[PDB]
Structures are given as C-alpha cells and as structure tokens.
Amino acid sequence: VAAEDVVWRWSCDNGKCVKLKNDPRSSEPALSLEACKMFCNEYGLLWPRPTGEADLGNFLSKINLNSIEVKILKKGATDDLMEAAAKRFKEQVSLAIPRGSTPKLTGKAVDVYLVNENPNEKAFSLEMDESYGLRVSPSGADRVNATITANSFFGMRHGLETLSQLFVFDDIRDHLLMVRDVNISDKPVYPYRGILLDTARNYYSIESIKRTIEAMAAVKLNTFHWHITDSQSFPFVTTKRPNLYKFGALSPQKVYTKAAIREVVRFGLERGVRVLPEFDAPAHVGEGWQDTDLTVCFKAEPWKSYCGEPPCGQLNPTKDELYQYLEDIYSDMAEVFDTTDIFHMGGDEVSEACWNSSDSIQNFMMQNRWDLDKESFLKLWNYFQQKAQDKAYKAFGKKLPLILWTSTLTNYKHIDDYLNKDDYIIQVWTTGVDPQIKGLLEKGYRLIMSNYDALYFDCGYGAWVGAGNNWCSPYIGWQKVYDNSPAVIALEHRDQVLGGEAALWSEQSDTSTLDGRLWPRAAALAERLWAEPATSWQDAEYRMLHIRERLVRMGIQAESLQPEWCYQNEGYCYS
C-alpha cells in the first residue's frame, strides 16, 4: 500500500470546526483539525480552562522540537523538583505529535523561563498557592519567549502543564506548532482535587498507580487518596506488625513495600500530587488480623446480618493491645507517606450487630454502665475513635487534620458530641441533595464531596454478589460528573467545601480496568473543581473529546466517549 496523505481541512463556522475538502485551487491556507480547534473553541485545546485571563491570540508558529530549552531563573530547595518538572515537559510536548508521525525539524526555538517566587516552598497544604501566570510571545527573529511566573513550585508545575497544551501537530504539513501570543492567569477554585483508589478489594500494580498519577497531573488534580486496607486484604507493608501483610495480602507479590511507597510518594510530589493514606477503622478490617484476637465477626455468616458486604469484620475497641497495633501502623504509614498533610481515618458505617455479638464486648459495656442499644454502640465508636486519634497524632508527630466519611457518627445532629470542626474534615458520599450536607455546613464542618450519585466511578456494572447490576447503578457519565457542582450543593457555605474526589471502589476493578474507570471521567471533575464553571457540560464537550485523545496519547487506556467522527465533525452529533 502507498499510504495516503490527509485529504481534509477544517474551517471555523459558528464555533464548530467543519470538515471540507482540501481542494488544490485555493489561495487560502488549509487548517488541520487541531489548529482550527485551537481558535474556533472559546478555550481552544485547554483542559481545564483557566480561571483568569485566557488570551490565546489568533496565530500559530512553527517550532523545532529539538530547540526547546527550559531555564530556571530562581533557584532554591525545590531545585530538584523544578529540574524534574522541566525534563518531563520536553517529553510532554511530544505528546502533541501522534505516534508514528514525525515532525519536520525546522522552525523557531522556544525558550521557557520559570520564575518560582518562593523556591524553597515544597509542602502540601490546604492553603498552598497553586496560582500561576503564563505569557508567550515572539522573541527576536528566530525564537519564542515562554514565561511562567508563580508563587510556588506547584503553580509553576501547573503552568508547565498548561504550556504543554499550547502545542499542536499539523498533520497536513508535518509541522509542530505553538500558539504565538498568549496571556494566561490561573488558579484553582478548590484546594482538594482528588481520586480515591481502593487497593484492597483488588490489587493495583504500582506501575498502574504511577500511571494514574501521571494522568492526574495532566489535568491538575492534586490528591491521590489511597484506600490501602480493607477487610478483603492488607497489602501495606508494616515493618512493625509484619503479620498483617503476611497473612493479609492476596499474595506475597501483591504488596506495597516501603520502597514502592516512597517511590509513589515522590512521583506524586514531582507532579504536584499529595499522596494521602487511609487506614479505615473500626469497620472494614479482616484479613491480616487472624490470631490476634483483635477483631470480631471476620467472615461471619450470614453476612447480610452483620455487614454491608462480605467479608464481615470489625476491630474490638475493648482490647488495649489494639491501640498498640494501631500506633505501629499509623507510624509505619507516617514514615513513608511523608508528604501528606492530612490523614484519612475511614469511619464508614460500623455494624451494631457485629459488636453486640461479642460477649467480650458486651461485658465491657455492662461494666461501664452503658446499655446494649444503638445509642450505646455510638459511645463505643467514639471511645475507639478518640483513642485511635491519639495514636494517629503521636504517629505523625503533630496534630493534623483528619478525615472521616459521612456516617451515623457524623450525623450533624450529634456530631459535636464526638468530633469538632477544626479537627475533622468530613468526606461526603451521600447524594448531593441529602439534608446532612446543609446540616453539616451550618455546624461549620468542612467537606470533601464524593456524592455517590455523581462521583462513584464503580457504579453501573454487573452485580458482584448475585445477579443484576451493582448497587449504585446506573453508570455515571462524564456529563453528570461535570454538572455536579459543590457550589450549588453548598450555596453560601461554599468556602467550607474543600473540594471533591472521584471514588473508585474496587470490588470490580483492578490493574487492568483502572484507566477506563478513571479516564476521562475524572477530567470532568478536574475542570469542575479547578474552574467551577457557570456553564454546563455541553459547553465543555468538544474539549472533553480532545482531552480524551490526549490521555490515549499518553498511554492511558481511556474510555471512549463518542465516535471519532464526532470529534472531526462538530455539531453533527447532538441530542
């Protein structure tokens, strides 16, 4: 076969790029699809779109791939991180070029200048500055000046990410192009932009976790919430209490060693991603605890009587030794997850029946004058949480914010009996319309939104117990994730919302299915959290298709949203 050449061209008409034949008898220069898209779309090819200035100009300039140089103007303690970020950037620019295509090495030279105004700052915090400014302009006759200015390394890295998005490959001519005149100013609306990955229901290769982080960085998501343990498995390698992993793991290979974790944590830091660890308690414990006598109900049957899902099992708060185990686990986590400013302690629904089933437990309650009703079991949960919390603080070596899921414990009506708003952040998984949300906000609580009607990425597949479909079906499309707005959910109490997180529970997901589950749906969340657009999904639709293509180019096995024909023929596919 003699491979053909691209035969089509694209022209902007009413905000839509229309495909037209590239006829020879024309004096007007043909535009490639991406080139037309960059100026046809209001925000061009950017995802997420910026919150401030977004001036992309009207032109593109041909660039030579081998002539891109990055210079770091202000040196500091973040030099290593900055140097790493710069290196990644050269590689990102290539992603513009489709695989198997080769650009002509001609054109201008690009100079990228990074101005990090506080070069020593590298800690993750809810108050950290993620803002940046980007300007691109012609410099002299043969080069381009790209200048990124930010208050911190984090803003600077976000700026490099936006800059990488200003490159387009012209497949008609085989030219690498770059936007000529750019003025951009940006910062995120919300500090916490996350993805929860459950690695206990099924194991995820460390390569996959890193790939996930690479994708997150590409859309300015900053938090990876590692739900490391559950009743099904204990893959965290705890040096202090090694039997938990030894007994706990699905296999000896299916484990997360200290070196692997440091590796992931560092990989995250370079990409502005906080790796936040969760040790869920006192429910969701099982495997790895055999022979300790520190749990009750593991594998209790019938399972339905004792828990939400099999296997059943919970910690026994009445055993003093448990707090010793917990201290050790929290300490081992703190050692390796050393960039995190926050610790998640789980707290999803505890089972009354399960606790009531232990005489050892009942005796303890009897001795303490408490009865055996629901109110009393709440007392037991609080007793546990208070003790666990002390251990967590001791482990991290300071008081730090702690996260808990919405639960019976966190009901706004009695939450103050147990928790306080300064010390606890509440992760919300109820529907976006649930009354608990307003009530919690009124009490001053900060929230992370993960409402299941919009943010549960596991939803919609086949049932994993029995037949039918899984519990939270239907499957949530990107359109729905995009339209779910925390600002709408919280109204006037908006500042109290820290952000949001997409949740990938793993009863039905693993190394193999993760790219699909997460991408590009998490990108919808990324834009929503970064920008809080007043606009709807339909306004972001064309760009969403582009970002999906970009994730694929990165090597992500992203879900397919629409026929490629739609991407090539804007406005034709609608409903």
Ligand X SMILES: CC(=O)N[C@H]1/C(=N/OC(=O)Nc2ccccc2)O[C@H](CO)[C@@H](O)[C@@H]1O
Binding positions for ligand X, rule: CB under 6 A: 308, 348, 405, 429, 456, 458, 471-472, 505, 507
Nearer of residues 227 and 446 to its own copies, judged by Cβ:
227
Q: Which residues contact 390 (CB under 8 A, 6 or more apart)?
A: none
Residue 516 interaction partner, one of its own copies, ligand X, none, beta carbon < 5-8 Å per kind: its own copies
Min. distance of Cβ 348 from ligand X in angstroms? 4
Look up residue 9 and give its DSSP letter.
E
What are the helix (H) ranges across 98-148?
A: none
Per the annotation, the verdict on 284 as an active-site residue is yes
**Among the residues of 425-563, which ranges form H helices?**
435-442, 452-455, 478-483, 486-490, 514-518, 521-531, 537-553
Task: Compute the least distance from the CB of residue 471 to its own copies, in Å.
Answer: 11
CB nearer its own copies, residue 467 or residue 534 = 467
> Side-chain half-sphere of 57: how many Cα atoms within 13 Å?
16
Q: Are 482 and 453 in contact (CB under 8 A)?
A: no
3-state secondary structure 283-314: ECCECECCCCCCEECCCCCCHHHHCCCCCCCE
Q: Which does 374 bind (CB under 5 to 8 A by kind): ligand X, its own copies, none?
A: none
Shortest distance (Å) from residue 206 CB to its own copies: 13
Q: At 434, which helix (H) or strand (E)? A: none
Beta carbon of residue 281, minimum distance to ligand X (angstroms, whole number): 13
Secondary structure of residue 36 in the 3-state scheme: helix
**Residue listed under structure tokens 């006192």:** 282
Nearer to ligand X (CB atom), residue 289 or residue 405: 405
Q: Could you tell me where the beta strands, DSSP code E, fall in 338-423?
A: 343-346, 402-405
What size, in residues, is the chain?
Answer: 575
Closest distance between its own copies and the C-beta of residue 58, in Å?
27
Pairwise CA distance, residues 448 & 280, whole Å: 17
116 vs 232 by CB, closer to ligand X: 232
> Among its own copies, ligand X, none, what binds residue 563 when CB lies within 5 to 8 Å by partner kind?
its own copies
Count Cβ atoms below 10 Å from residue 200 Cβ, excluding itself. Answer: 26
User: Nearest 5 degrees, angle CA 145-CA 116-CA 274?
Assistant: 120
Closest CA to 564 of 2, 1, 8: 8
462 binds, options its own copies, ligand X, none, Cβ within 5 to 8 A by partner type: its own copies
What span, in angstroms and rounded, lies between the C-alpha atoms of 293 and 245?
16
What does DSSP assign to residue 349?
A: P
Active-site pick, 42, 83, 309, 349: 349
CB 116 within 8 A of CB 71: no
When the beta carbons of 203 and 325 are compared against its own copies, the nearer one is: 203
Of 32 and 61, which has the nearer Cβ to its own copies? 32
H or E element in which residue 445 lies: none
Kindly tell me which of 55 and 349 has the beta carbon lying closer to ligand X.
349
Taking the complex as a whole, the smallest distance from the CB of residue 39 to its own copies amounts, in Å, to 22
CB 229 within 8 A of CB 236: yes
The listed partner (its own copies, ligand X, none) that binds 460, CB under 5 to 8 Å by sort, is its own copies
CA–CA distance, 462 with 127 (Å, rounded to integer): 41
Decide if 225 is catalytic: no
CA 199, 201, 203, 208 dihedral sign is: negative
Q: Which does 348 bind (CB under 5 to 8 A by kind): ligand X, its own copies, none?
A: ligand X
Least spacing, CB of residue 206 vs ligand X, in Å: 21
Residue whose Cβ sits closest to ligand X: 505
What element of type H or E holds 213? helix 206-218
- Tell the smallest beta-carbon distance from residue 165 to its own copies (Å): 21
- For ligand X, give the closer residue by CB, 348 or 541: 348
Let me know: does 51 contact 187? Beta carbons within 8 Å: yes
Question: CB atoms < 10 A from the CB of 245, how many?
Answer: 23
Asked if residue 506 lies in contact with residue 464, where contact means CB atoms within 8 angstroms, the answer is no
Tell me which of 230, 327, 332, 348 is the catalytic residue.
230
Partner from its own copies, ligand X, none binding residue 362, C-beta < 5-8 Å depending on class: none
Q: Which does residue 4 bind out of its own copies, ligand X, none, counting CB within 5 to 8 angstroms by kind? A: its own copies
Is 321 designated active site? no
Nearer to ligand X, 458 or 527 (CB): 458
Nearest approach in angstroms of CB 151 to its own copies is 38
- Decide whether 114 or 455 has the Cβ nearer to ligand X: 455
In angstroms, give the least distance from the CB of 249 to its own copies. Answer: 8
Give the separation between CA 434 and CA 79, rounded to whole angstroms: 46
479 interface partner picked from its own copies, ligand X, none, CB below 5 to 8 A per type:
its own copies
How far is it, in rounded angstroms, from Cα 8 to Cα 18?
10
Of 227, 284, 344, 546, the active-site residue reads 284
Residue 308 binding partner per list ligand X, its own copies, none, with a CB distance cut-off of 5 to 8 Å that depends on partner kind:
ligand X
Rounded-to-integer distance, Cα 385 and Cα 370, Å: 17
Catalytic residues: 230, 284, 349
